[PDB]
Design a protein around this ligand. Structure first.
Ligand SMILES: CC[C@H]1OC(=O)[C@H](C)[C@@H](O[C@H]2C[C@@](C)(OC)[C@@H](O)[C@H](C)O2)[C@H](C)[C@@H](O[C@@H]2O[C@H](C)C[C@H](N(C)C)[C@H]2O)[C@](C)(O)C[C@@H](C)C(=O)[C@H](C)[C@@H](O)[C@]1(C)O
Ligand SMILES: [Mg+2]
Ligand SMILES: [Mg+2]
Ligand SMILES: [Mg+2]
Ligand SMILES: [Mg+2]
Ligand SMILES: [Mg+2]
Ligand SMILES: [Mg+2]
Ligand SMILES: [Mg+2]
Ligand SMILES: [Mg+2]
Ligand SMILES: [Mg+2]
Ligand SMILES: [Mg+2]
Ligand SMILES: [Mg+2]
Ligand SMILES: [Mg+2]
Ligand SMILES: [Mg+2]
Ligand SMILES: [Mg+2]
Ligand SMILES: [Mg+2]
Ligand SMILES: [Mg+2]
Ligand SMILES: [Mg+2]
Ligand SMILES: [Mg+2]
Ligand SMILES: [Mg+2]
Ligand SMILES: [Mg+2]
Ligand SMILES: [Mg+2]
Ligand SMILES: [Mg+2]
Ligand SMILES: [Mg+2]
Ligand SMILES: [Mg+2]
Ligand SMILES: [Mg+2]
Ligand SMILES: [Mg+2]
Ligand SMILES: [Mg+2]
Ligand SMILES: [Mg+2]
Ligand SMILES: [Mg+2]
Ligand SMILES: [Mg+2]
Ligand SMILES: [Mg+2]
Ligand SMILES: [Mg+2]
Ligand SMILES: [Mg+2]
Ligand SMILES: [Mg+2]
Ligand SMILES: [Mg+2]
Ligand SMILES: [Mg+2]
Ligand SMILES: [Mg+2]
Ligand SMILES: [Mg+2]
Ligand SMILES: [Mg+2]
Ligand SMILES: [Mg+2]
Ligand SMILES: [Mg+2]
Ligand SMILES: [Mg+2]
Lengths: 118, 123, 209, 56, 114, 6
RNA sequence: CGAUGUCGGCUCAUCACAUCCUGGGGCUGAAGUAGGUCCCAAGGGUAUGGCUGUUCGCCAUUUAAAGUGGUACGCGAGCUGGGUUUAGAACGUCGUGAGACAGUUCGGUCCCUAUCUGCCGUGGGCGCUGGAGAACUGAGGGGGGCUGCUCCUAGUACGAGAGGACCGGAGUGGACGCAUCACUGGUGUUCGGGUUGUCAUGCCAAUGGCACUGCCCGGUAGCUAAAUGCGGAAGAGAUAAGUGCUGAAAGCAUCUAAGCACGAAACUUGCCCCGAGAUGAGUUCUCCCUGACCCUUUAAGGGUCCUGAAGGAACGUUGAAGACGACGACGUUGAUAGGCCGGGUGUGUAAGCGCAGCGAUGCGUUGAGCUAACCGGUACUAAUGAACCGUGAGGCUUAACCU
RNA sequence: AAUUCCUUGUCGGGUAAGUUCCGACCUGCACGAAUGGCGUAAUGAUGGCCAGGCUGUCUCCACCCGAGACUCAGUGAAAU
RNA sequence: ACACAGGUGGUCAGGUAGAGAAUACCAAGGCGCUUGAGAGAACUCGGGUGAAGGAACUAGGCAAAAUGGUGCCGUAACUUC
RNA sequence: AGGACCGAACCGACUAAUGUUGAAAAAUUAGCGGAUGACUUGUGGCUGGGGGUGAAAGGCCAAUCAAACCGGGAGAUAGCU
């Protein structure tokens, strides 16, 4: 039974999932569009969208909180100086998932995920 | 939740210091004994000049449980250790003359009217 | 007596002034509009058919919307039937309120259980597990033996085995009606009724003495 | 455990009566490119629902 | 849960005082000794508070007659007549379950003053 | 050990 | 004998009645209470430990009772491997000896991915005669059926006393079963905090990785029992053993031959669940389709053009539903999921700055900061315009009506 | 008794209850003196019994984290 | 027999903590083990936690749980000292 | 000083689980014994089948041991299938 539960396990342990979505969040902020599988792009929205709601208010305490969840300063400097100002008048829904074909090597359903203004 | 092989402290002045439950009386395949339930015990430790000797087989009544009792408004009253009062095998009247520590209102009936009379505190 | 159709809202507690905890289940019994009345000369048996709630007008199909427009009632979310007793009569379109249970002391509530999926024999049939230690080889929660030898040489029908548990209609009988709240369409029964929050319940008065 | 008699070509083909693939019902057509694609998927030229979304 | 929350809030007490874990409190409950009624106190230390609305509870622990006794009260029950804080305590936690292995001079809680 | 019926 | 694994334990059972308890009766050397014995009855129920490899037995303490048997002395392609039975070694005994014991003693590898039947679940296909969406009926089948103690009647009936009821009624438990999460709790490696060693982000401060989640302390939702609601019935029909009424054959007698009435947890129902593949394929309600032409083998015939309805499927967002199918909700005329806003819950007074202190650290801002699965809202993102399947009024005979 | 069949010999201790354990008696089926007799401190992955602590061994299981089992794409056996 | 969780002699010997060539985390250096993507049923393997009880389990405390360091105090019968 | 003590390398193989068409024709994981000695190890050499060698188990002598393996007598013999 998994009644009323959230989060996908994605065939990893607890610390591999946290390290994968942290690298993958730094790849979507940096490039503004990446191509992943469809179950990973759906679980990415729960990671990368709270980072942009964090980055709408500028303070030193919030920058130290978005550094503890990204571990990169090239990403924190872009969230607060670029993505904060853009999404400052939008109430959620900063990403967009576009389904595409299947992967050649294992027939996985792939999908693009992009920040909503490009 | 007292069951068989459970070692209980003793809450009267009969002389016994630790007794072990050897039977839960009052039903077939019966498992547990809450507060106010007769058990059949054996004496494991005793002071030298008490009324009972180590090795005797007696009856008892459970007066405190670590599992605790529940009140009709949902409240719970727990204790830090299981305790009991030694009864006579046949008359089922308490052997001792004093009760130590608090007891509960689950003993308030005609069967155990002499235990909540000697009790220092009833919760 | 006929019953009503409701919805399990969830559990709460009712405090009485003598200090008692009563676990009640809240059932939102909206008005039950009668859709069709069955009789002996046309249907072989006497019953009424009620609907409750409301449905989206773009979701009702053409066969269903014609069945409601014959009665004049508005389209609810389902259709249930109730067998009439000797002396009860209802009319098409009449709405039945929760005041049917005003002086009823006990009710039977039937619903669809929670789904536990494919459950093994320890969860489903309360079997005993075997030893977790002492030499056991890959056989801790398995059923064990399922028959006898050459006689009969088969497993009997109705053998207790692992399979789908829950998600089935069960009836819980003789629940105390604690409080009927007619002005906001509530019914507080005493105890646990089957089903998850938001599921349909059928509340009939108690048939046992 | 293992069989006691060889299963036929009849029983083998009956088992494969549910192994049959089904085809995609129909393909959607984009409204500015006219390309066929899967429904709710982007086309091979990066168009989706009248808009070019993947400029690659 | 607009139905249920409206059912519970017409049963909640409007006069519950503010207390924290560590506070020494005195709870007065209604006792029925057959027919006659009474009020006995329960002076002890609040070691756990459960905040859930109508289903709010709190746990008191006192050493009575040499035997430690815990009691879990329902906050909005009409058995509990009055709650009264006797002393404010200073702890760094929300559940003082470590006070079950301590006794005597080790179970002393500092006073808060703020 | 009771290895073969005997 | 080109192999049908042995005793015992565990797990799961199923049947018989020669009945252990509960149920109904006759006789009693049956006053009452408690018994003895026999007849009917298989619905349900029918112990925990000490010793021993033990089944068995003895013992301790319960219980209403701790039934007797069959099922390859039920059950190793379900588990164990303790035992009287491989190879090592020793004692006692027998043998000159190799060795042997019917005696004891310490140690000693238990394989198999299920084709068929069977059973537990769950779907696809076709049928049910135009197609479709619902709601039913109920042939049939399954589940359930246990019982203690206290009080009243009543210290009455009975009895010299001691003692002590039948019938009827109320309350409260044990075991079992079904549901559930409001409460008490468990879990909660997806929430918060404390702390050890070390590496890193240039450094301080603040953080992150790793060491079983590093080790711990709490804890939301969900799941759950030890938690808390409910159940077993009453009633009816036909009976068993039994008890009779009227009554002859047999002027009487006689429960029986004609006739009539009682009679049990067994049977048929009543309670709950599945159920029209019930091919005997049922019933009711609603909805949809009202064009043209040609030919042969002229018949429930085949083809062309137009047409595509009700509804379904498919795809997407998903669910207290789920192995996959299936089932439920929703798809812009939209709260289906994610996000966001507000709250709640949990943790326990963040970071930065200021002050006190030689310093660890304390204090103020501050019940602060963070907060998963929760509650109430909000179209910001994703749920597309289509396309696909499904047709065009539905055979013959006979009857009754309208014509 | 690593030896005793009768035998769970009988008495005492331990336990609520002990066919095993310890101490004895001698009726040694069928001990016995270098195929050594009786003791013996230390030692033993040695045999038997008891107690304290500890615990999912168990009453009686519940929840969680991972690797399979299930679904999809690729390759693709075996006993019989 | 395999691109096989096995076997195979010698030499070198960094930092922090540590008695240490143990162990944890790192440097130089080398790798992520030649099928993947989902789902989050029974059951099996490997682990974490558990209310009350605490060997009642069993042939048997099998297996798990627990103990665990340095300094100082203190330590019985028996003894071949 | 010690066939002394605790304990890594090294040597072993007491218990349990897994594996049993295995990753492996004897291993893996978690614990376990010895660990300056009757220790352990590399390279070469010697002992040959009714023979060797054996701190003795009928152990070992190339996955074979109450008499190795290869070739021959040889198409031994088979009242048995
Ligand atoms: C790893 C897998 C091996 O299996 C085992 O180890 C199991 C556990 C044996 O039991 C073990 C353990 C045990 C107690 O038997 C269970 C013992 O009796 C036997 C000798 O060895 C089996 C089953 C034996 O059968 C039994 O042999 C008996 C002589 C007669 C019996 N009879 C009923 C047909 C029969 O089933 C026997 C001989 O090994 C089967 C033959 C074919 C083999 O030699 C095969 C090749 C085995 O090596 C094996 C299959 O590879
Ligand atoms: Mg995988
Ligand atoms: Mg095995
Ligand atoms: Mg196992
Ligand atoms: Mg047959
Ligand atoms: Mg054969
Ligand atoms: Mg047998
Ligand atoms: Mg078998
Ligand atoms: Mg031998
Ligand atoms: Mg023999
Ligand atoms: Mg096996
Ligand atoms: Mg029936
Ligand atoms: Mg809790
Ligand atoms: Mg935790
Ligand atoms: Mg620092
Ligand atoms: Mg690192
Ligand atoms: Mg880690
Ligand atoms: Mg014992
Ligand atoms: Mg002796
Ligand atoms: Mg001798
Ligand atoms: Mg001799
Ligand atoms: Mg001599
Ligand atoms: Mg001699
Ligand atoms: Mg495949
Ligand atoms: Mg490889
Ligand atoms: Mg290798
Ligand atoms: Mg080496
Ligand atoms: Mg190392
Ligand atoms: Mg799992
Ligand atoms: Mg526990
Ligand atoms: Mg505990
Ligand atoms: Mg035992
Ligand atoms: Mg036992
Ligand atoms: Mg062990
Ligand atoms: Mg040494
Ligand atoms: Mg060796
Ligand atoms: Mg090892
Ligand atoms: Mg050593
Ligand atoms: Mg030999
Ligand atoms: Mg060899
Ligand atoms: Mg020879
Ligand atoms: Mg010759
Ligand atoms: Mg020949």
């Amino acid at each position: 039974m998994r009644h009323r539960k959230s989060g996908r396990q994605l065939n990893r342990n607890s610390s591999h999932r946290q390290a994968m979505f942290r690298n993958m969040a730094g790849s979507l902020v940096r490039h503004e569009i990446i191509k992943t599988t469809l179950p990973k792009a759906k679980e990415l929205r729960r990671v990368v969208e709270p980072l942009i709601t964090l980055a709408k208010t500028d303070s030193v305490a919030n920058r130290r909180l978005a550094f503890a969840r990204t571990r990169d300063n090239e990403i924190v400097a872009k969230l607060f100086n670029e993505l904060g100002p853009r999404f400052a008048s939008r109430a959620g829904g900063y990403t967009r998932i576009l389904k595409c074909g299947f992967r050649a090597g294992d027939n996985a359903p792939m999908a693009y995920i992009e920040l909503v203004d490009r | 939740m007292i069951q068989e092989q459970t070692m209980l402290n003793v809450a009267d002045n009969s002389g016994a210091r630790r007794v072990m439950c050897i039977k839960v009386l009052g039903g077939s395949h019966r498992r547990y004994a809450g507060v106010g339930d007769i058990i059949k015990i054996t004496i494991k430790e005793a002071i030298p000049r008490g009324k009972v000797k180590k090795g005797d087989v007696l009856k008892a009544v459970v007066v405190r449980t670590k599992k605790g009792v529940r009140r009709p408004d949902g409240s719970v009253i727990r204790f830090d250790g299981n305790a009991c009062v030694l009864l006579n095998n046949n008359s089922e009247q308490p052997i001792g003359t004093r009760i130590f520590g608090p007891v509960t209102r689950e003993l308030r009936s005609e069967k155990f009217m002499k235990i909540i009379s000697l009790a220092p505190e009833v919760l | 007596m006929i019953g009503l159709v409701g919805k399990k809202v969830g559990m709460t507690r009712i405090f009485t002034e003598d200090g008692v905890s009563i676990p009640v289940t809240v059932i939102e019994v909206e008005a039950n509009r009668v859709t069709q009345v069955k009789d002996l000369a046309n249907d072989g048996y006497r019953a009424i058919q009620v609907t409750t709630g409301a449905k989206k007008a773009n979701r009702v199909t053409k066969p269903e919307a014609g069945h409601f427009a014959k009665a004049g009632v508005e389209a609810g979310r389902g259709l249930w039937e109730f067998r009439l007793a000797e002396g009860e009569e209802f009319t098409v379109g009449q709405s039945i309120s929760v005041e049917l249970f005003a002086d009823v002391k006990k009710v039977d509530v039937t619903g669809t259980s929670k789904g536990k999926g494919f459950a093994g024999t320890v969860k489903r049939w309360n079997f005993r597990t075997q030893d977790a230690t002492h030499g056991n080889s890959l056989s801790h929660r398995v059923p064990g033996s399922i028959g006898q030898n050459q006689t009969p040489g088969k497993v009997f029908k109705g053998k207790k085995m692992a399979g789908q548990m829950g998600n089935e209609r069960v009836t819980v009988q003789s629940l105390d009606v604690v409080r009927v709240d007619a002005e906001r369409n509530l019914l507080l029964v005493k105890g646990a009724v089957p089903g998850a929050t938001g599921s349909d319940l059928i509340v009939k008065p108690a048939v046992k003495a | 455990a293992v069989q006691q008699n060889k299963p036929t070509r009849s029983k083998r083909g009956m088992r494969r009566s549910h192994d049959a693939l089904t085809a995609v019902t129909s393909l959607s057509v984009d409204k500015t490119s006219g390309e066929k694609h899967l429904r709710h998927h982007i086309t091979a030229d990066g168009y989706y629902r009248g808009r070019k979304v993947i400029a690659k | 849960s607009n139905i249920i929350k409206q059912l519970e809030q017409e049963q909640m007490k409007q006069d519950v005082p503010s207390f924290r874990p560590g506070d020494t409190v005195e709870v007065k409950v209604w006792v029925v000794e057959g027919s006659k009624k009474r009020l006995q106190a329960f002076e002890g230390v609040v070691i756990a508070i459960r905040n859930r609305g109508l289903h709010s509870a709190f746990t008191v622990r006192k050493i009575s007659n040499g035997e430690g006794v815990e009691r879990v009260f329902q906050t909005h029950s009409p058995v509990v007549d009055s709650i009264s804080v006797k002393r404010r305590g200073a702890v760094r936690k929300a559940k003082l379950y470590y006070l079950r292995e301590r006794t005597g001079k080790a179970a002393r809680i500092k006073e808060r003053l703020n | 050990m009771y290895l073969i019926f005997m």
